[PDB]
Structure of Cellulose-binding GDSL lipase/acylhydrolase:
Amino acid sequence: PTYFFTFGDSYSQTGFSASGTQPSASNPMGNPDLGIGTTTNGPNWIGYLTTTENASLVLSYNLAAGGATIDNALVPAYPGDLASQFRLFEDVYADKPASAPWSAEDAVFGVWIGINDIGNAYYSTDAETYTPKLISRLESLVEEVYKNGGRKFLFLNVPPTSRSPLFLEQGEEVVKQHAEYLSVYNENLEGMVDDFTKKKGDVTTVLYDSWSFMTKILDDPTAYGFPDATCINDDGTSCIWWNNYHPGMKYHLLQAEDMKPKLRKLGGW
């Protein structure tokens, strides 16, 4: 099987507990049931990659936690920052236990972080000098998994949360300030992933440009079956937005479909 360990924020959360039912062939998410615990009204991108877009057996260990930032020593928010998710991984799965006997050839580490770091710091920090600190801390966490023997990595860049209803309501100049800051973060993320890839020489990496994908939908919503780019519906399917800051299940399914061909080199797609 492919062991898919994920790390991130509310765009990735499912409510998976390390003490809940663990992933197996008959139950690849482990816990909770597929479609529960998300910000989408249904499966999220991880549920869809694991159970709908998979080419072979994928087992999902999803450590993402709502509200997470990279490290509370930089931009703080909630206790379950990315650093704490890596610590949970180190405590339970890093040593390849019988419940998750992974190897360099069959483990994929997916990270989707930055929404909240940017969301909280875009007006109070200098993007050009501050976002390298965030990205360097992300890289140091990734190095912990590399030391454990991880070699396959998936990074998603930050999507245009500047154009969520929550931000649009703050005025176009705030949308722009946030978007400009976000663009610098994503450029630095790309640089780091490229540099890591070249320096190690023995890793398989994907940088998934969620920003451009979601932007395409926001720019032409009706081509994707949405009536406009701003409406909210908690059914997760009628609108792009499930709530004012989170996209719904239909969006996540469209993203997972977009991702599938780009993930073929990682082993489960």
